[PDB]
Write a protein that binds this ligand. Sequence first.
Ligand SMILES: Nc1ncnc2c1ncn2[C@@H]1O[C@H](CO)[C@@H](O)[C@H]1O
Ligand SMILES: Nc1ncnc2c1ncn2[C@@H]1O[C@H](CO)[C@@H](O)[C@H]1O
Lengths: 330, 330
Amino acid sequence: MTRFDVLTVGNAIVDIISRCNDQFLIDNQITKAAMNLIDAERAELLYSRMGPALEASGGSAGNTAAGVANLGGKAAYFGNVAADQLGDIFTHDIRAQGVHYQTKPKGAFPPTARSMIFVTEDGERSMNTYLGACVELGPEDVEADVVADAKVTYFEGYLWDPPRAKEAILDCARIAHQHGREMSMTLSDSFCVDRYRGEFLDLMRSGKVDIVFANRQEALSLYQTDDFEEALNRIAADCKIAAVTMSENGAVILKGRERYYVNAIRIREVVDTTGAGDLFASGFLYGYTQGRSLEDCGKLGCLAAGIVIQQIGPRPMTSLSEAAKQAGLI
Amino acid sequence: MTRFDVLTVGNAIVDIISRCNDQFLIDNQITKAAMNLIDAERAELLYSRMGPALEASGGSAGNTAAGVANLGGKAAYFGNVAADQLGDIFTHDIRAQGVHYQTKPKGAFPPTARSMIFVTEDGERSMNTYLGACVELGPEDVEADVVADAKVTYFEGYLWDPPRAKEAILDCARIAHQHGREMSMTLSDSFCVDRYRGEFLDLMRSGKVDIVFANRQEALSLYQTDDFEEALNRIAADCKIAAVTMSENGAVILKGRERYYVNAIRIREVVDTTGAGDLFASGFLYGYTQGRSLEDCGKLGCLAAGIVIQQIGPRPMTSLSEAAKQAGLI
Ligand SMILES: Nc1ncnc2c1ncn2[C@@H]1O[C@H](CO)[C@@H](O)[C@H]1O
Ligand SMILES: Nc1ncnc2c1ncn2[C@@H]1O[C@H](CO)[C@@H](O)[C@H]1O
């Protein structure tokens, strides 16, 4: 028995969420469906144009850790906030879900990261993120005992944007593998993959990452191809296990020459896609650390992802364990 | 023409919202369906026990002003926040709705008011409010030109808790009535009525308040009676116009010997009752300042209230003007 099933590591962010029309994205030169990095001045400008909003704790890996805990797994999280009200919100929400979260703020400035997320009528989400205190996450924030005692340590490709987070991740990889654990990453966003393609492939090929999460766009971006079959063949050669999501078309899990396709749940209405990939990773990694088949891990991922897109906000407000039991995935 | 249809005045609050079981309220000695005032220490304690939450700008009168603006009316708001992140959220959300909001923060301490609102399975809401910077609202915050230029000035009974807000209200009443405008209040909460019964009746009987909003519980509390018919007869005698809501049983508008009964709208589900009364006041006052019949004012109020209870959070995220046009109230 170990202390943790899943440790996740990412940019600690509070989401500021509002609905907009498609013209808003065009007028403001916001790339639809993507993570758009912004500076403090641009954050002020976009906020001044944003309608009334709702706030909810976010951060891709934060959401994944919360989802693991929700399902009943034992989760931990590394991510840096500031000693401010937004940081206090973030700290409360993740700890209240039962995730181990002990990363200490380094003062009030830079302030806690926030992402202005604009949800269009089709339920797509377009994020505009000021990293703030996330730039301070570094090797000093690695709780070595936690990495050692976690079955899987999972991190965001998004961590390659701040300056020193990658150093923490390399430390995690060393500790995890020295203690016989596994490392996992998400490719996070197609433009993120554009930025760090070579680095990501090296993480996989050197064996620093064992399990990779991608959506279709990310997989295509990783190999700069329009051929999805090529992307699947290549990603399977580059990592031990790959979990590739395809929105309404479900998911495919690859291991060597093995492929396991999983159907997406049929949806009432797509309210807000924010968190879909994050919660797919929650379901998959919960199943994986419970010793479930790759197909069942995919099923658990699709169930969690389907639930989160039927609500506003990135962390399911309902019980995923109850949902999983009803679905016979238990 | 005037600059404003409705000026509202209230405790400026950010809501922190979570779902709980009925046992949680009992274990924590939270009075169900009520506004429970709390100190800083109790706020810390309750927060430590609360699950993951979402944040949304609140404040009863704030919500009412936002609803008037949503419907297409011209609204203003007086309420005091701190110079902190929660205050910045509050300031953003109300201004983004098109409400004039110019009250200046006085410092960072006390911090911006917040209310932990626990929603039970029946959709009832139980609020736990630390007033924070609201204790600083006073006569200095009265923008006399705004009061002079507003058709109706509406305020919360809740303002009788902080120490100096009542002085601002008395100043508002004077300026309003000297400029031929009307004053309105809501009784806010049955325990609030218990605390300030005599003062509230004095506001009405002296004519400082022209239009009074109450729910059934508040009306009964005002006259310490179990007889709803008595309460209606007495409230009609004590104020020029009374609007009394009765939840699923709609509302009754009273003027002198006149009575206008209005039905509740048909609804999908009671998700969260937070804001119901606030938005009834939005609909009513919007109608009133557009020169509509008292019955139509009631119908607009019931429409807005019915909309808000079908969503999480206190301010409608959909267009009230569009809904009013579709319902044929225009
Ligand atoms: N640069 C980023 N790094 C990590 N997570 C992010 C970033 N920008 C937005 N997010 C998060 O992505 C989540 C949706 O997957 C949101 O909850 C949001 O907080
Ligand atoms: N003491 C108070 N004064 C004014 N508004 C309040 C108080 N406590 C809670 N509220 C607000 O009541 C609203 C619902 O009517 C919520 O949005 C919440 O912010």
